[PDB]
Paper text:
Here, we show that a core component of the fork protection complex in the eukaryotic replisome, Timeless, harbours in its C‐terminal region a previously unappreciated DNA‐binding domain that exhibits specific binding to G‐quadruplex (G4) DNA structures. The FPC comprises four main proteins—Timeless, Tipin, Claspin and AND‐1—that are conserved from yeast to mammals. Inspection of the amino acid sequence of human Timeless revealed the presence of a conserved domain in its C‐terminal half (residues 816–954), with a predicted fold similarity to the myb‐like proteins of the homeodomain‐like superfamily, that bind double‐stranded DNA (dsDNA) with a tandem repeat of 3‐helix bundles (named here N‐term and C‐term). Our findings indicate that Timeless contributes to the ability of the replisome to sense replication‐hindering G4 formation and ensures the prompt resolution of these structures by DDX11 to maintain processive DNA synthesis.
We used X‐ray diffraction and NMR spectroscopy to investigate experimentally the structure and dynamics of the newly discovered Timeless domain. The 1.15 Å crystal structure of amino acids 885–947 (C‐term), corresponding to a single myb‐like fold, confirmed the presence of a three‐helix bundle characteristic of the homeodomain superfamily of DNA‐binding proteins, extended by the presence of a fourth C‐terminal alpha helix unique to the Timeless domain. The N‐ and C‐terminal domains adopted the same three‐dimensional fold; in particular, the N‐terminal repeat shared the presence of an additional fourth helix, H4, as seen in the C‐terminal repeat. A distinguishing feature of the Timeless DBD is the presence of a fourth alpha helix in both N‐ and C‐terminal 3‐helix bundle repeats. Superposition of the DBD C‐term onto the structurally homologous domains of the telomeric protein TRF1 (Court et al, 2005) and bacterial cell cycle regulator GcrA (Wu et al, 2018) in complex with their dsDNA substrates shows that, if the DBD were to adopt a similar mode of dsDNA binding, the fourth helix of both its N‐term and C‐term repeats would likely lead to a steric clash with the phosphate backbone of the DNA. Although it is conceivable that the DBD might rearrange its conformation upon DNA binding, the fourth helix of both repeats participates in core hydrophobic interactions, mediated by conserved residues L872 and F879 (N‐terminal repeat), and L936, V937 and L943 (C‐terminal repeat), making such rearrangements unlikely. We found that it bound with low micromolar affinity to both ss‐ and dsDNA probes. Indeed, when we tested a well‐characterised G4 sequence present in the promoter of the MYC gene (Ambrus et al, 2005), the DBD bound to it with nanomolar affinity, and about one order of magnitude tighter than ds‐ or ssDNA. While Timeless DBD binds to both ss‐ and dsDNA, it binds with ~ 10‐fold greater affinity to a defined G4 DNA sequence.
Residue numbers in the entry: 885 to 946
Write the structure that this text describes.
């Protein structure tokens, strides 16, 4: 794996998150669509660090 994000990798993460956030497996759809190898837990932490979600439970809303 890698653990840092280039500017373009961050923008890609955001586009995929925006698309898949209402699915039942947002992280799975993100991971299927990025080329870099990354762990699920690190991607979750990056979504939090960017403020795309404010806390973990927002990744799976009712």
């Amino acid at each position: 794996h890698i653990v840092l994000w280039t500017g373009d990798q961050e923008l890609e993460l955001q586009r995929l998150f925006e698309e898949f956030r209402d699915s039942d497996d947002v992280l799975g759809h993100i991971m299927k669509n990025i080329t870099a190898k990354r762990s699920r837990a690190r991607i979750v932490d990056k979504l939090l660090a960017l403020g795309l979600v404010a806390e973990r439970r927002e990744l799976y809303k009712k």
